[PDB]
Write a protein that binds this ligand. Structure first.
Ligand code: NI
Ligand code: NI
Ligand code: NI
Ligand code: NI
Ligand code: NI
Ligand code: NI
Lengths: 101, 566, 100, 566, 566, 100
């Protein structure tokens, strides 16, 4: 007996289903670490990350909400992106789009 | 991508199909539905989702909610679902999917710059309790009640005076006016009951016009057929509720005579089992009628080993009786019957008893209405198993039946369900956040009108709010004007019309009671059973359709010694 | 800890009892507030141990004798009442004429 | 039928001829009269008398009282009688026989639906004490005073500042205005004293127009003949009282010069014995004059074994004196004389000293004015026996003489006796209920303006209000607006006329002081003796008509170690 | 006549040339000037100077001060001088020689009948502290802060909700309005910060018009270049301050990008060292810019042996991070660097860091801003000796440099220096009186708007205010309306114009912020250094002009175990 | 004494610990509030003695064992946090899984 215990049924949850995704190779050319969040517009991450910004347009990381991918200096790795939904209107970040798309 | 269900629960709280044990009881609830879109859940913190342009949008204040409770496991009479809760203007705005419509799908609760966030992932959210049997013996009762999760308090009294010790009555215009002004200082919604024991209608009408939302008929002031009929006549013409504490001494007639006096008119029977008052030994038979809204006071809930022993002296002190006067002791003894005490638990489980209340410091414990209601649920599951209405391998239905007893049912009974009582859009945001391990015992957060009013708080000079000693302390929602704005003082339609609020210069928000005459047993959510119940005059045995109703006294209960320091 | 107002209140009773306990230990005849606090604290620990209400109503009358308290004190206390959390919830213990 | 007197007392409290011991002292009071009709007494409780159509009637609110104190043993300057007390509109309505005129005889206090009931059978009821020597060093003093039974507090100060530490002065318009606003938050009637030490009348008039009800002349600010005469001139033209703390150093003249400066004008002399301040060593001779209203502060009451030892350092700290400065220590020592301390007790017993006060945290104990007054009564009975005015085998007269010292006499002296001071019809309902065993020590109930403001209260979550721990907690009469309605802020006639209450936006009820210039020693109830008293300049011996006045120091007192935890 | 300097100091406090040790630290201050005329000092007490016609005059209220602090040793950014302080209308009136012009020379502060006196001889008087980094997690923080000597609190929050736990933001009109009303109940000057994280200017303008005096950019809500630029644009057009908590994750760019986003516009950087938040590992380089007003939060002050060990879990709880999530733990670890923690102390000593604040219950201790600032001063003297600006054999300059950090500098930064921040004529009378032995730890008196609001107070029933137990209790300046009159609620110029105070019906005095856009590093009193600072990306070493900046961790500190019970 | 609000608050913790200490002495299996108070008070005295934060974070896990508390209590306390005045100022001690 454990007060307030859960009895989670076994299995898994498939996240962001039925949405376009793409894989991109990213490399941190900065001398300092960079950590990117689950919902940050990837195309506008720190300029030190070298990748095809053009492909990651309107995309975010395909990772469970609230988690992140860290890039230590000089780190290179392939990440999977998932396309924004809703109105697909990007506002904020580095101010590169500030509108629909 | 993919995430295992266990890791998922650890981050966002349980989802569809997962079960959670309520505190240390034997009750398990199962998430019936989850309103989120997997992978699109909103979470707050450094580097999380709720950030500009991401899970938070560019909308103005009028277009987003003021407060969002993220990933909340809602437990209410209508369901046990996982969802986000949006609060706007101190009222419940929506129950759905919170986020930024700009980049997220199915967002029904928009989060903007003007939105505050309360993280409910892994927590259980319920509406604020409603105690309709308060004796205003001391102002300190409000904080005790609020800490336990009760956000609305109905009753009467003028302080520690003989009359209030025994009955829930704020006698007359002057005291009613005084108590209405004093209510602005308390962090809970309040509604007053006047003294309904009079055979002159005008003496009652004055009290109703002064502001009371109901009239209390207590035997200590004479609960005779004439008094009862008089109160019901005024109640009928002013749309207010009547609370009854019948004639235990059978001085003016038996229970059937009282029932005759009522004449099929709507009425709320207090402590229907009888220990706290009522015709000996069969007041419990009132629960069989369609116009009676029956409730229990808490000391007899649930039936335990020490229940009886504790009752005699409690009753003497409450009602100002004398142990050196034989008739006074026989009066007390005639009210305490093991037979009806045991039946009461079962009748609650069947839905024959529709409400639970305290009877604060007058044969009741103000901070134990929620706690005892769940103790009864536990003991009944242990003794009678699943209810005929259960579906699935959980206690979801029994949970819905019991939570309604101190939330929506008390609200329907007193005509305030239009403002409080449940988590439904448009209702005042009186919510209580619980951690599954302390459900029904110690709340994590108590929200009044959209502002946290009391919560556990650690060392004030600490680097974070968690270090010891952690004990309940008043928050901003309980301070001066912020409080006035976040609480409601319930008036009668007449008092509202007369401009009582303006004359007394009340500072809090005003709510008006309505629909007190039209509610009947059938309207009590999950508790509308009208059983063919009988009580043996000699043995006091309770029978429903001839079968014997009874239960066994508990020696140990959950939500007891594992949580309290004393 | 999440101490509610009622638990914090009982801390006041417990502390008052500590004061009385030490004076009795010195051999002083206890006064009115010291006596009430001592016997009350006793019952609370009784409930913590798991004793029944009926047992405590009895044992409560054997904590202090008439020769351990000041003159007039026994008459100033016709009874003592205190509630505590028993294994089966909060219960009221009433001790009549605790000091004999 | 017939009932034995003992059984009768047990149910309804003592009646004519019965005696009751006050706490643990040697004082006994005897019921002089009982205003009831035997067999027709009203009693509240389940199955009792106060019930619809029986002891409660059908009258409207305007025709019955709001509160009734049943079977009360009243102790006041005018009598020690058994009667019911009716309260209406926050004021004393009647002292007679409560009940239902429909079926009961001689009912003068009608009980209806609008009537709350407080059961006083077996209790002693007195008016609320009035302390006219308050130093507003901290707001916490109000609750301490209220718990002890003092409902009105007069004095001055701005908080813990050097000036207030030493004197009862709220200096000037700004501080007076500030303290008047702060007073709305305190649960006691309040009246402020300004700094009267000035030789320019206009500086005094401003303060009076700002709101003070009197002016304090303290030596710490220079109590010179010029200052004294100036204050008295303004007092004479504005109808306010002057409180005096004379020139101990005899710097400007001796006592006879101060008396010359006063010139036969009405004045209240603080701590007339001298320990707390005044011409050394004969300020005590002031009590011989018709225009002097003499009072004692409480540390020297009564003369005990530890009185002297405790006084030196107390005096140093209060008046900001330096023990390394010879003249400062000699000043302190010249004020402490065993001879006058011993005489003071006797002079109170004879009626030469008319008031007792505290001198809160400035050589006085705010919660011990009532307690010490009775300790003096006890010690005087023990040493001098019955007073020449006693009749019967009781101490009824000595009790009337002493209770007047902290009730009516302080009220007459400060011109507020028209509102408070005694239990008489039309006066504000500031009453205190005591259990005979705790009389003068710990009240059972403290009522302010018709609402209980503070009372002993047990476990808030308990099934009744009696379980431990029982300690004093604030009630509804001390909350927000209810409090504003139940307390009075005394203004000067000028301040009232100027609209000070409206300008400062005071929320409490306003009362105006009047009759301060016309009261004289002869008006002090039971304490109007003007003795031919002398003090030997060398030995400090006090003599009245040549006979030596003195008493012995007590080693043990009642109302002491049997009631307090510390 | 003649008096020895030692005897003089014992009576009137130290004079020119005398030195005083601050608490138990190694800092000594030396009286630079004394504004008195020897032999003409004013002193209060029985038989002292401040008496009618002597040290007190015949002037009317308008011609004398309401309060005088006699013989005070003032410690402020402008000097360490001995003088009397006159207070009138709740504002500082003069700093000079108090007395009666009728008989005394050089009297600049006239004492009359309307003057209250506070004796400061032997005490140190400073202005009230100003904490600009408050998280409104609980109302209890105000008293904790007030007791420590901080009289003004700036920040945001809505109570114990996730958002406020992590950031100083009162999100939107409804919560801003609620918190503004709640602020009337608190005994400190308050100003609110809204949530500035939005890329839509209108969402910010609403908040400013609702009442906030600044906008907080926290990374928990996304501190991206777009959000930062948006907040600064509105700040520029509404004259409000921006507080920044940069992007630690370097998600949107490095520190140089954030600095680019700011574009030379005025901004207040919170916890500039980085532990409490900001670009890893070089946010500390911000202190080199002219438009940046840098401040430290208190847990890293000063560098001690237990600093590091304590930081990790503190950070996790504050920002709602998960220790089972690798990226969350790496985030926390990247913020805690021994290298920058050690440099921070030195940078404060050099004047590169201009403010110290708490970060109340969100990686900071609300009652330790003053205490820790002095601990840093002590440790720096011990390690680096005298500053190049010292003159004489004292630490007067280091004391002026450090006291400015929590008084005038925070006031200039947030545009409220026109009302508070220092002891200068015309400024609100928020003063704190200290006994040299408890300087910076436990105040003797805390004055708010000319009225004592909190002070140590002993036994309430005692014969004097000194007997034990002595602990801090609220005074008259913290009660109802008196408090409203003695505190200020700072609004934005727009909110003031819109009539927000009238609409919300705020009761306190209103002050408006101005001059937030024009302050720059050069305006920070004694702390305007703009060093050429660098941080090694790999080793985190801090360098100024190539030289290594560092210090050693303390094992024991003053103002610690000798003063606290726990 | 000049007790600030925070010192008076800690007096509440200390007293709650006195209650727990005595029950443990009687051989009772401690409950949730008693356990938190006991271990917390321990750490405070640790700081008073002058022990470092790192030491206490360790020692705090050896005050009460799983067999000294009621069922479920160990899981109800994933960590315990308390601050006290060390020789080098106030510091936060966090003890993870204090009861094993
Ligand atoms: Ni009842
Ligand atoms: Ni009841
Ligand atoms: Ni005096
Ligand atoms: Ni005095
Ligand atoms: Ni921050
Ligand atoms: Ni912060």
């Amino acid at each position: 007996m454990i007060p307030g215990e859960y009895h989670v049924k076994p299995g898994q949850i498939a996240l962001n289903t039925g949405r376009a995704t793409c894989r991109v190779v990213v490399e941190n050319h900065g001398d300092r670490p960079i950590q990117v969040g689950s919902h940050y517009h990837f195309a506008e991450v720190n300029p030190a990350l070298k990748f095809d910004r053009q492909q990651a347009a309107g995309y975010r990381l395909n990772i469970p909400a609230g988690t992140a991918v860290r890039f230590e200096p000089g780190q290179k790795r392939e990440v999977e992106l998932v396309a924004f939904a809703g109105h697909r209107a990007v506002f904020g970040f580095r101010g590169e789009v500030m509108g629909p798309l | 991508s993919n995430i295992s269900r266990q890791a998922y629960a650890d981050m966002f709280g349980p989802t569809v199909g997962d079960k959670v044990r309520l505190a240390d009881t034997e009750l398990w609830i199962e998430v019936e539905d989850d309103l989120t879109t997997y992978g699109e859940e909103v979470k707050f913190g450094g580097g999380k989702v709720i950030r500009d342009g991401m899970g938070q949008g560019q909308m103005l204040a009028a277009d987003c909610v003021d407060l969002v409770l993220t990933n909340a496991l809602i437990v209410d009479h209508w369901g046990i679902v996982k969802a986000d809760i949006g609060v706007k203007d101190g009222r419940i705005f929506a129950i759905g999917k919170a986020g930024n419509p700009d980049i997220q799908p199915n967002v029904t609760i928009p989060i903007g710059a003007a939105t505050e966030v309360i993280a409910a992932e892994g927590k259980i959210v319920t509406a604020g309790g409603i105690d309709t049997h308060i004796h205003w013996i001391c102002p300190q009762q409000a904080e005790e009640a609020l800490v336990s999760g009760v956000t609305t308090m109905v009753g009467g009294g003028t302080g520690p005076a003989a009359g209030t010790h025994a009955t829930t009555c704020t006698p007359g215009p002057w005291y009613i006016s005084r108590m209405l002004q004093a209510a602005d200082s308390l962090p809970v919604n309040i509604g007053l009951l006047g003294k309904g024991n009079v055979s002159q209608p005008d003496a009652l009408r004055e009290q109703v016009a002064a502001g009371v939302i109901g009239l209390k008929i207590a035997e200590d002031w004479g609960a005779t057929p004439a008094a009862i009929d008089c109160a019901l006549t005024v109640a009928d013409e002013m749309d207010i509720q009547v609370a009854l504490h019948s004639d235990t001494l059978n001085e003016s007639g038996f229970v059937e005579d009282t029932l005759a006096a009522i004449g099929g008119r709507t009425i709320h029977t207090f402590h229907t089992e009888g220990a706290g008052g009522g015709h000996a030994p069969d007041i419990i038979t009132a629960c069989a009628h369609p116009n009676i809204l029956p409730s229990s006071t808490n000391p007899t809930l649930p039936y335990t080993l020490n229940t009886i022993d504790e009752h005699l002296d409690m009753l003497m002190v409450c009602h100002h009786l004398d142990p050196d006067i034989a008739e006074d002791v026989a009066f007390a003894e005639s009210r305490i019957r093991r037979e009806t005490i045991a039946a009461e638990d079962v009748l609650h489980d069947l839905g024959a008893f529709s409400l639970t209340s305290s009877d604060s410091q007058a044969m009741g414990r103000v901070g134990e209405v929620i706690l005892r209601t769940w103790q009864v649920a536990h003991r009944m599951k242990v003794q009678r198993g699943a209810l005929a209405e259960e579906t699935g391998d959980n206690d979801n239905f029994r949970v819905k039946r019991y939570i309604a007893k101190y939330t929506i049912n008390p609200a329907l009974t007193h005509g305030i369900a239009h403002e409080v009582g449940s988590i439904e859009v448009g209702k005042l945001a009186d919510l209580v956040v619980w951690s599954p391990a302390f459900f029904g015992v110690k709340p994590a957060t108590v929200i009044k009108g959209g502002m946290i009013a009391i919560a556990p708080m650690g060392d004030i000079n600490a680097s974070i709010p968690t270090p010891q000693p952690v004990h309940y302390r008043p928050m901003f929602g309980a301070l001066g004007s912020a409080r006035h704005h976040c609480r409601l003082t319930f008036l009668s339609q007449a008092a509202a019309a007369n401009g009582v609020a303006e004359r007394l210069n009340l500072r809090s928000a005003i709510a008006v009671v309505k629909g007190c005459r039209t509610v009947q047993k059938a309207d009590m959510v999950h508790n509308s059973l009208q059983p063919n119940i009988t009580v043996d005059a000699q043995t006091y045995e309770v029978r429903v359709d001839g079968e014997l109703i009874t239960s066994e006294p508990a020696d140990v209960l959950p939500m007891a010694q594992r949580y309290f320091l004393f | 800890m999440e101490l509610t107002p009622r638990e914090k209140d009982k801390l006041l009773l417990f502390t008052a009892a500590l004061v009385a306990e030490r004076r009795l230990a010195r051999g002083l005849k206890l006064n009115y507030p010291e006596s009430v606090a001592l016997i009350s604290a006793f019952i609370m620990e009784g409930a913590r141990d798991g004793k029944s209400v009926a047992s405590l109503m009895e044992e409560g009358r054997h904590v202090l004798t008439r020769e351990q308290v000041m003159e007039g004190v026994p008459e100033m206390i016709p009874d003592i009442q205190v509630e505590a959390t028993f294994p089966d919830g909060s219960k009221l213990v009433t001790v009549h004429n605790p000091i004999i």
